[PDB]
Amino acid sequence: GAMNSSNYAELFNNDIKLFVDDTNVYRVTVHKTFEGNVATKAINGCIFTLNPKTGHLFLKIIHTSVWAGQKRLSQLAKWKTAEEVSALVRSLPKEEQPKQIIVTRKAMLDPLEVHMLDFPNIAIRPTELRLPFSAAMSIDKLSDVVMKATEPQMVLFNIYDDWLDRISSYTAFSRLTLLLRALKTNEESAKMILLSDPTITIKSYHLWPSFTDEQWITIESQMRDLILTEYGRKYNV
């Protein structure tokens, strides 16, 4: 059944599982036409498929060409997501196939279940967690490869960089969700916090800066402060 606060530690056990977030699959700009009607222009999107234990990210780039001449795109987007996740599972060796896929949005359950009928042993699960994976396009290097894509493309990342050399999966996932929650609540402020010190750089093969254990504690503190401030503002409390 549903993944929640109560069964959180299951994410970091030794059963292979993937989170699938479809938020950034179908992306549009809304604009006025010459006649003063409103129209959308699609931009490149991505499926965010993440192994929360290993940090392996399967970023399937959704090129705007996939929408050409299609109707009801927000509905198609859920089925296209389900088709690409099913194709990813089929492409993995048997011992790398997930035992569970957790969808961040309940509208993905039926599309994914129907695409995965060939895999009756892979459990498709919703979650009660409000995960900030929509903010993935606030990670500069992920945003850059999506926007530069000229065709459908799969790009592999480790969203935890080298953190698992020093910290547990549990702690790596907590840092990731805190960074993305900050980027989601106030992108400008969050990105300012991450780069304010020019001496701390991002390795060519990494997504985040090369913080020492001490600098991560300060960074993580600055992100929690950003989130609570914005909450007081949002709500006037």
């Binding site: 198609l76 089925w79 389900a82 039926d110 599309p111 279940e113 129907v114 695409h115 009928l117 060939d118």
Partner: protein
């Protein structure tokens, strides 16, 4: 006009024959039901006054043999049986009629209700859903589970309705996942109609049989089957026009006949709201939508 005699009525029981029902008192001199219309299936059903649990009964067709009811004090129920001796049976029935110990099947001449509920229902199809091939009649009760319910435990006592599952390989062609899930026309027309049922008559026959089992025995699995067969048609964008027109008539009589008080347990809100208001066929069931809106507006 045919007769189902009763040896006796030793226990107090509500007896149903099709949509009609009679209270019989313990050891009341009741010897059966006469003037049963030839040309239809019939169901004779029981609810003991002492156990308003287990409605049970027998589907039969008087053209297939001479049937009578006899109470079994060991198994504690009214059993249907076949009398193979034609002369012994006509002799039993003539005696009981002469003594007027039989109720008359109370058909109003104007009234096509039973025909309308059983139009496509055929005894040979009932005997494949309810397997007990040494009898020509079929026992059904409140508690019998369907093959589909069993999959999700005694197969001898199962209702072998055609399994319908919208999230199955049977329902969804590889490469047409979204198309086949949102428009079930290929599942209805190729798999079910051409493949399994052979024609719309057999499909409607099982649909009508499932409804009647739901209504007369409160058989929950039958209710599931009736709803699934409705939903498969309404969720298909492409249905023969004769099938839609016939489905409207079938559903109209089922809704018309349903006890007003049982709408809450026998009618699935999601299926009906989807079928009348969202589905491809939302505009194709005018009679059924009109009777549902006037009789069960709460459910919608």
């Amino acid at each position: 006009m045919n007769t189902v005699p009763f040896t006796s009525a030793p226990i107090e029981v509500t007896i149903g024959i099709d949509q009609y029902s009679f209270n019989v008192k313990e050891n009341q001199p009741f010897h059966g039901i006469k003037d049963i219309p030839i040309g239809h299936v019939h169901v004779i059903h029981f609810q003991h006054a002492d156990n308003s649990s287990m409605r049970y009964g027998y589907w039969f067709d008087c053209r297939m043999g001479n049937f009578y009811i006899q109470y079994d004090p060991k198994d504690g129920l009214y059993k249907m049986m076949e009398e193979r001796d034609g002369a012994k049976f006509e002799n039993i029935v003539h005696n009981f009629k002469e003594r007027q110990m039989m109720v008359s099947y109370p058909k109003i001449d104007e009234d096509d209700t039973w025909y309308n509920l059983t139009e496509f229902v055929q005894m040979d199809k009932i005997r494949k859903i309810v397997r007990k091939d040494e009898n020509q009649f079929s026992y059904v009760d409140s508690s019998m589970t369907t093959v589909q319910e069993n999959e999700l435990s005694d197969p001898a006592h199962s209702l072998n309705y055609t399994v319908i599952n919208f999230k199955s390989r049977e329902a969804i062609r590889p490469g047409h996942e979204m198309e086949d899930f949102l428009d079930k026309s290929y599942y209805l027309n190729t798999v079910m109609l051409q493949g399994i049922f052979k024609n719309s008559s057999n499909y409607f026959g099982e649909l009508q049989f499932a409804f009647l089992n739901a209504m007369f025995f409160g058989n929950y699995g039958s209710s599931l089957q009736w709803h699934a067969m409705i939903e498969l048609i309404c969720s298909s964008a492409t249905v023969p026009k004769h099938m839609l027109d016939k489905l409207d008539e079938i559903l109209y009589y089922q809704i018309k006949t349903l006890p007003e008080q049982y709408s809450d347990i026998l009618l699935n809100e999601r299926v009906w709201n989807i079928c009348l208001y969202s589905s491809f066929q939302k505009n194709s069931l005018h009679n059924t939508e009109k009777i549902m809106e006037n009789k069960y507006p709460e459910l919608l």
